[PDB]
Amino acid sequence: XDXXX
Amino acid sequence: SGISLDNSYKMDYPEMGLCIIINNKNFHKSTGMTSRSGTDVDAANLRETFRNLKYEVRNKNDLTREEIVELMRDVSKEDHSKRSSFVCVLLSHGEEGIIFGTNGPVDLKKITNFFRGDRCRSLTGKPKLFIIQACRGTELDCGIETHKIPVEADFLYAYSTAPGYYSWRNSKDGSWFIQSLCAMLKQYADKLEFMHILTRVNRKVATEFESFSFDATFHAKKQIPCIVSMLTKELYFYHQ
């Protein structure tokens, strides 16, 4: 899955 | 001898140099930062990619801010005289100018300052590459349908994302930027100058990836990486 940093 | 040109860095020292990879996956419970699923895939991809470019790779996992600083100080104090270059890859949560240790932030300038031309003399005149997979802010790209040298010279910062923007990571394949960087180095390091490799990484990230989210705020978003070069010569990973 995406998700962010 | 004949006519000589000095347009590319000397990359035929006995060693290519160190590649330090700081892989922060798990953060202190105290900080409330989420586990960076996918980052081990990035760290493995980078270790293999840089191994094949003949870098001495050192992987470090889940370092506190104090450990990141101590590591970078210690590495900058090694004798790099026999090394062509230096590479550091940072995989973590971040904000503009900041990378997270497992227990809080470190300014990127604090890390890079150890390698300044005046402070790491055995790297003066050699390329110092910092590859940074971390967010640089909270903007979302919605896309559109289609006799001295400066102490800051000879650094290259390969950022995963534009200033101000989030940077995206997939739990199975790794971050969009590191997947793409490793793919392009594997295909083109024996063929193209590094800025041209990084431009292909820009295109790959920009064109092949788009977020998918059940939350509309974060759905269908795009990313462009950001090459920041203070290099003074062309950089080829190979030599004749």
mmCIF file of C-alpha atoms in Angstrom:
data_model
loop_
_atom_site.group_PDB
_atom_site.id
_atom_site.type_symbol
_atom_site.label_atom_id
_atom_site.label_comp_id
_atom_site.label_asym_id
_atom_site.label_seq_id
_atom_site.Cartn_x
_atom_site.Cartn_y
_atom_site.Cartn_z
ATOM 1 C CA UNK A 1 0.000 0.000 0.000
ATOM 2 C CA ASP A 2 0.980 3.573 -0.366
ATOM 3 C CA UNK A 3 1.305 5.661 2.099
ATOM 4 C CA UNK A 4 4.290 8.932 3.161
ATOM 5 C CA UNK A 5 7.404 10.206 4.940
ATOM 6 C CA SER B 1 51.632 13.519 -22.872
ATOM 7 C CA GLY B 2 48.826 14.716 -25.114
ATOM 8 C CA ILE B 3 46.035 17.205 -24.466
ATOM 9 C CA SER B 4 44.357 16.619 -21.109
ATOM 10 C CA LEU B 5 40.863 17.537 -20.005
ATOM 11 C CA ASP B 6 39.687 17.907 -16.408
ATOM 12 C CA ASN B 7 35.906 17.867 -16.787
ATOM 13 C CA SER B 8 35.074 14.781 -14.681
ATOM 14 C CA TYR B 9 35.864 13.701 -11.162
ATOM 15 C CA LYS B 10 38.702 11.229 -10.720
ATOM 16 C CA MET B 11 36.857 7.993 -9.911
ATOM 17 C CA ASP B 12 39.806 5.575 -10.167
ATOM 18 C CA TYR B 13 41.149 5.831 -6.639
ATOM 19 C CA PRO B 14 41.691 2.421 -5.087
ATOM 20 C CA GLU B 15 38.231 2.519 -3.515
ATOM 21 C CA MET B 16 35.031 4.084 -4.766
ATOM 22 C CA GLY B 17 34.204 5.127 -1.206
ATOM 23 C CA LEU B 18 31.695 4.527 1.563
ATOM 24 C CA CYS B 19 27.964 4.320 1.094
ATOM 25 C CA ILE B 20 26.355 4.831 4.501
ATOM 26 C CA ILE B 21 22.669 3.928 4.566
ATOM 27 C CA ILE B 22 20.642 5.102 7.551
ATOM 28 C CA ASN B 23 17.416 3.110 7.541
ATOM 29 C CA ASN B 24 14.938 4.373 10.134
ATOM 30 C CA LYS B 25 11.902 2.165 10.252
ATOM 31 C CA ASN B 26 10.728 2.014 13.875
ATOM 32 C CA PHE B 27 10.425 5.122 15.989
ATOM 33 C CA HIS B 28 10.267 5.519 19.715
ATOM 34 C CA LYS B 29 6.730 4.956 20.927
ATOM 35 C CA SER B 30 7.265 8.225 22.724
ATOM 36 C CA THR B 31 7.395 10.214 19.433
ATOM 37 C CA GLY B 32 4.176 8.874 17.866
ATOM 38 C CA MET B 33 5.854 8.521 14.468
ATOM 39 C CA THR B 34 4.553 5.598 12.382
ATOM 40 C CA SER B 35 6.559 2.609 11.240
ATOM 41 C CA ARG B 36 7.947 3.165 7.747
ATOM 42 C CA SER B 37 6.666 0.058 5.979
ATOM 43 C CA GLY B 38 8.617 -0.613 2.813
ATOM 44 C CA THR B 39 11.825 0.954 3.975
ATOM 45 C CA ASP B 40 13.640 -2.393 4.386
ATOM 46 C CA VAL B 41 12.950 -3.055 0.689
ATOM 47 C CA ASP B 42 14.636 0.319 -0.084
ATOM 48 C CA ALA B 43 17.589 -0.392 2.181
ATOM 49 C CA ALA B 44 18.163 -3.814 0.558
ATOM 50 C CA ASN B 45 17.782 -2.348 -2.944
ATOM 51 C CA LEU B 46 20.323 0.357 -2.187
ATOM 52 C CA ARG B 47 22.775 -2.051 -0.587
ATOM 53 C CA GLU B 48 22.721 -4.222 -3.714
ATOM 54 C CA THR B 49 22.819 -1.306 -6.146
ATOM 55 C CA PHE B 50 25.783 0.346 -4.482
ATOM 56 C CA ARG B 51 27.572 -3.004 -3.953
ATOM 57 C CA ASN B 52 27.587 -3.453 -7.721
ATOM 58 C CA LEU B 53 29.049 0.046 -8.117
ATOM 59 C CA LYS B 54 31.862 -1.123 -5.786
ATOM 60 C CA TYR B 55 30.994 1.055 -2.805
ATOM 61 C CA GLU B 56 31.732 -0.166 0.692
ATOM 62 C CA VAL B 57 28.156 -0.204 2.002
ATOM 63 C CA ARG B 58 27.399 0.195 5.674
ATOM 64 C CA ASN B 59 23.773 -0.233 6.693
ATOM 65 C CA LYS B 60 22.587 1.253 9.974
ATOM 66 C CA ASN B 61 19.091 0.670 11.296
ATOM 67 C CA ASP B 62 16.836 2.665 13.679
ATOM 68 C CA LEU B 63 19.344 5.297 14.896
ATOM 69 C CA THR B 64 18.454 7.986 17.436
ATOM 70 C CA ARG B 65 19.280 11.608 16.643
ATOM 71 C CA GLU B 66 22.380 11.306 18.859
ATOM 72 C CA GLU B 67 23.484 8.144 17.042
ATOM 73 C CA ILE B 68 23.011 9.783 13.620
ATOM 74 C CA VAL B 69 25.234 12.686 14.649
ATOM 75 C CA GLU B 70 27.870 10.438 16.246
ATOM 76 C CA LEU B 71 27.936 8.192 13.160
ATOM 77 C CA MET B 72 28.375 11.079 10.756
ATOM 78 C CA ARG B 73 31.040 12.719 12.911
ATOM 79 C CA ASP B 74 32.950 9.437 13.128
ATOM 80 C CA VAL B 75 32.687 8.709 9.389
ATOM 81 C CA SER B 76 33.867 12.274 8.570
ATOM 82 C CA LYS B 77 36.916 11.660 10.730
ATOM 83 C CA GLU B 78 38.038 8.559 8.806
ATOM 84 C CA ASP B 79 40.877 8.806 6.318
ATOM 85 C CA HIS B 80 39.174 8.902 2.930
ATOM 86 C CA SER B 81 42.413 9.581 1.030
ATOM 87 C CA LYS B 82 42.182 6.360 -0.989
ATOM 88 C CA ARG B 83 38.460 6.823 -1.713
ATOM 89 C CA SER B 84 36.989 8.503 -4.810
ATOM 90 C CA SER B 85 33.725 9.732 -3.298
ATOM 91 C CA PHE B 86 31.316 9.538 -0.384
ATOM 92 C CA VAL B 87 27.627 8.567 -0.377
ATOM 93 C CA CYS B 88 25.104 8.847 2.399
ATOM 94 C CA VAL B 89 21.497 7.687 2.037
ATOM 95 C CA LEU B 90 18.929 8.824 4.623
ATOM 96 C CA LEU B 91 15.608 6.964 4.836
ATOM 97 C CA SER B 92 13.233 8.433 7.395
ATOM 98 C CA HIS B 93 10.435 10.763 8.235
ATOM 99 C CA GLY B 94 11.390 14.372 7.525
ATOM 100 C CA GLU B 95 10.401 17.975 7.031
ATOM 101 C CA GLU B 96 12.135 20.715 5.071
ATOM 102 C CA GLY B 97 15.759 20.667 6.122
ATOM 103 C CA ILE B 98 15.222 17.933 8.740
ATOM 104 C CA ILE B 99 15.579 14.144 8.976
ATOM 105 C CA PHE B 100 14.166 12.174 11.893
ATOM 106 C CA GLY B 101 16.155 10.046 14.228
ATOM 107 C CA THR B 102 14.071 7.467 16.062
ATOM 108 C CA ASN B 103 13.659 9.921 18.995
ATOM 109 C CA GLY B 104 13.435 13.293 17.256
ATOM 110 C CA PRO B 105 14.845 15.544 14.502
ATOM 111 C CA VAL B 106 18.331 16.259 13.174
ATOM 112 C CA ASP B 107 19.027 19.239 10.929
ATOM 113 C CA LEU B 108 20.383 18.038 7.596
ATOM 114 C CA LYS B 109 22.898 20.901 7.711
ATOM 115 C CA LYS B 110 24.366 19.456 10.916
ATOM 116 C CA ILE B 111 25.033 16.112 9.156
ATOM 117 C CA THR B 112 26.375 17.610 5.929
ATOM 118 C CA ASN B 113 28.567 20.165 7.695
ATOM 119 C CA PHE B 114 30.874 17.354 8.899
ATOM 120 C CA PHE B 115 31.880 16.794 5.263
ATOM 121 C CA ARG B 116 32.510 20.445 4.300
ATOM 122 C CA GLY B 117 35.635 21.072 2.229
ATOM 123 C CA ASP B 118 37.358 22.634 5.225
ATOM 124 C CA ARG B 119 36.236 20.007 7.766
ATOM 125 C CA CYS B 120 36.794 16.636 5.998
ATOM 126 C CA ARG B 121 40.062 17.266 4.192
ATOM 127 C CA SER B 122 40.437 13.783 2.718
ATOM 128 C CA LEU B 123 37.184 14.413 0.778
ATOM 129 C CA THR B 124 38.040 17.963 -0.377
ATOM 130 C CA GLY B 125 37.596 18.088 -4.153
ATOM 131 C CA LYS B 126 35.687 14.772 -4.189
ATOM 132 C CA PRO B 127 31.968 14.312 -4.766
ATOM 133 C CA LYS B 128 29.837 13.994 -1.655
ATOM 134 C CA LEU B 129 26.410 12.599 -2.456
ATOM 135 C CA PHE B 130 23.466 12.758 -0.044
ATOM 136 C CA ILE B 131 20.394 10.823 -1.144
ATOM 137 C CA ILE B 132 17.389 11.752 0.965
ATOM 138 C CA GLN B 133 14.087 9.831 1.070
ATOM 139 C CA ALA B 134 11.940 11.873 3.464
ATOM 140 C CA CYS B 135 9.167 14.452 3.257
ATOM 141 C CA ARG B 136 10.060 18.115 2.831
ATOM 142 C CA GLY B 137 6.704 19.546 3.954
ATOM 143 C CA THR B 138 2.984 18.876 3.552
ATOM 144 C CA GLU B 139 2.126 20.111 0.089
ATOM 145 C CA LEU B 140 0.379 17.678 -2.246
ATOM 146 C CA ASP B 141 1.011 17.638 -5.995
ATOM 147 C CA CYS B 142 -2.342 16.945 -7.714
ATOM 148 C CA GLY B 143 -0.657 16.732 -11.099
ATOM 149 C CA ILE B 144 -1.966 17.649 -14.538
ATOM 150 C CA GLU B 145 -3.235 15.515 -17.436
ATOM 151 C CA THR B 146 -0.778 14.865 -20.264
ATOM 152 C CA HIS B 147 43.678 28.624 -4.885
ATOM 153 C CA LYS B 148 40.660 27.992 -2.654
ATOM 154 C CA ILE B 149 37.382 26.280 -3.382
ATOM 155 C CA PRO B 150 34.113 26.958 -1.583
ATOM 156 C CA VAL B 151 33.473 24.768 1.462
ATOM 157 C CA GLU B 152 30.003 23.988 0.027
ATOM 158 C CA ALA B 153 31.359 22.843 -3.360
ATOM 159 C CA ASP B 154 31.273 19.203 -4.501
ATOM 160 C CA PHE B 155 28.038 18.239 -2.787
ATOM 161 C CA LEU B 156 25.059 16.725 -4.547
ATOM 162 C CA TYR B 157 21.702 16.336 -2.766
ATOM 163 C CA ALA B 158 19.361 13.920 -4.496
ATOM 164 C CA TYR B 159 16.045 14.679 -2.795
ATOM 165 C CA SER B 160 13.078 12.428 -3.273
ATOM 166 C CA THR B 161 10.636 15.296 -3.615
ATOM 167 C CA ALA B 162 10.320 18.996 -4.378
ATOM 168 C CA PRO B 163 10.782 21.538 -1.557
ATOM 169 C CA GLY B 164 7.652 21.753 0.565
ATOM 170 C CA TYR B 165 6.113 18.458 -0.576
ATOM 171 C CA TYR B 166 5.323 15.041 0.836
ATOM 172 C CA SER B 167 7.282 12.034 -0.393
ATOM 173 C CA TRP B 168 5.510 8.719 -1.036
ATOM 174 C CA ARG B 169 6.397 5.164 0.002
ATOM 175 C CA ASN B 170 4.814 1.844 -0.872
ATOM 176 C CA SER B 171 4.790 -0.916 1.716
ATOM 177 C CA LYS B 172 5.679 -3.687 -0.745
ATOM 178 C CA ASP B 173 7.971 -2.040 -3.292
ATOM 179 C CA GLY B 174 9.564 0.700 -1.193
ATOM 180 C CA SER B 175 9.623 4.397 -1.772
ATOM 181 C CA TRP B 176 8.856 5.624 -5.277
ATOM 182 C CA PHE B 177 12.124 7.532 -5.424
ATOM 183 C CA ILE B 178 14.450 4.790 -4.134
ATOM 184 C CA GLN B 179 12.816 2.149 -6.375
ATOM 185 C CA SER B 180 13.387 4.412 -9.326
ATOM 186 C CA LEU B 181 16.931 5.498 -8.331
ATOM 187 C CA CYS B 182 18.055 1.901 -7.941
ATOM 188 C CA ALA B 183 16.464 0.871 -11.271
ATOM 189 C CA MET B 184 18.196 3.696 -13.120
ATOM 190 C CA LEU B 185 21.585 3.122 -11.531
ATOM 191 C CA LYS B 186 21.373 -0.595 -12.403
ATOM 192 C CA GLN B 187 20.516 0.216 -16.024
ATOM 193 C CA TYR B 188 22.684 3.273 -16.664
ATOM 194 C CA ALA B 189 25.644 3.586 -14.261
ATOM 195 C CA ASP B 190 27.977 2.088 -16.828
ATOM 196 C CA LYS B 191 26.523 4.366 -19.582
ATOM 197 C CA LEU B 192 25.522 7.838 -18.399
ATOM 198 C CA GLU B 193 26.786 10.737 -16.323
ATOM 199 C CA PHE B 194 25.114 10.907 -12.900
ATOM 200 C CA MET B 195 22.973 14.011 -13.552
ATOM 201 C CA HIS B 196 21.568 12.289 -16.585
ATOM 202 C CA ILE B 197 20.846 9.194 -14.509
ATOM 203 C CA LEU B 198 19.036 11.338 -11.956
ATOM 204 C CA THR B 199 17.027 13.061 -14.729
ATOM 205 C CA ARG B 200 15.754 9.607 -15.815
ATOM 206 C CA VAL B 201 14.853 8.999 -12.141
ATOM 207 C CA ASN B 202 12.882 12.276 -12.208
ATOM 208 C CA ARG B 203 10.994 11.130 -15.276
ATOM 209 C CA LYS B 204 10.309 7.647 -13.879
ATOM 210 C CA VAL B 205 8.910 9.005 -10.619
ATOM 211 C CA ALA B 206 6.898 11.707 -12.370
ATOM 212 C CA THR B 207 5.325 9.427 -14.947
ATOM 213 C CA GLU B 208 4.989 5.932 -13.443
ATOM 214 C CA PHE B 209 3.614 6.595 -9.975
ATOM 215 C CA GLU B 210 0.418 8.004 -8.575
ATOM 216 C CA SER B 211 -0.979 7.553 -5.094
ATOM 217 C CA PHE B 212 -4.033 5.480 -4.293
ATOM 218 C CA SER B 213 -5.813 6.305 -1.063
ATOM 219 C CA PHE B 214 -9.192 5.704 0.479
ATOM 220 C CA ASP B 215 -8.879 9.262 1.877
ATOM 221 C CA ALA B 216 -9.605 11.702 -0.941
ATOM 222 C CA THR B 217 -7.134 14.227 0.562
ATOM 223 C CA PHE B 218 -4.286 11.898 -0.304
ATOM 224 C CA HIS B 219 -5.578 10.191 -3.404
ATOM 225 C CA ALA B 220 -4.277 10.543 -6.987
ATOM 226 C CA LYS B 221 -1.230 12.515 -6.005
ATOM 227 C CA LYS B 222 2.042 12.839 -7.870
ATOM 228 C CA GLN B 223 5.718 13.406 -7.034
ATOM 229 C CA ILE B 224 8.776 14.944 -8.678
ATOM 230 C CA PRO B 225 12.196 14.472 -7.130
ATOM 231 C CA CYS B 226 14.625 17.384 -6.863
ATOM 232 C CA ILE B 227 18.311 17.232 -7.865
ATOM 233 C CA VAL B 228 20.380 19.859 -6.066
ATOM 234 C CA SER B 229 23.902 20.011 -7.420
ATOM 235 C CA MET B 230 26.847 21.953 -6.170
ATOM 236 C CA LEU B 231 29.154 19.615 -8.078
ATOM 237 C CA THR B 232 31.968 21.121 -10.099
ATOM 238 C CA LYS B 233 32.652 18.173 -12.482
ATOM 239 C CA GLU B 234 30.806 15.404 -14.295
ATOM 240 C CA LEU B 235 30.463 12.233 -12.289
ATOM 241 C CA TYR B 236 30.734 8.804 -13.901
ATOM 242 C CA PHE B 237 30.688 5.671 -11.777
ATOM 243 C CA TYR B 238 32.994 3.927 -14.229
ATOM 244 C CA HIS B 239 36.524 4.817 -15.348
ATOM 245 C CA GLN B 240 38.683 3.810 -18.326
#
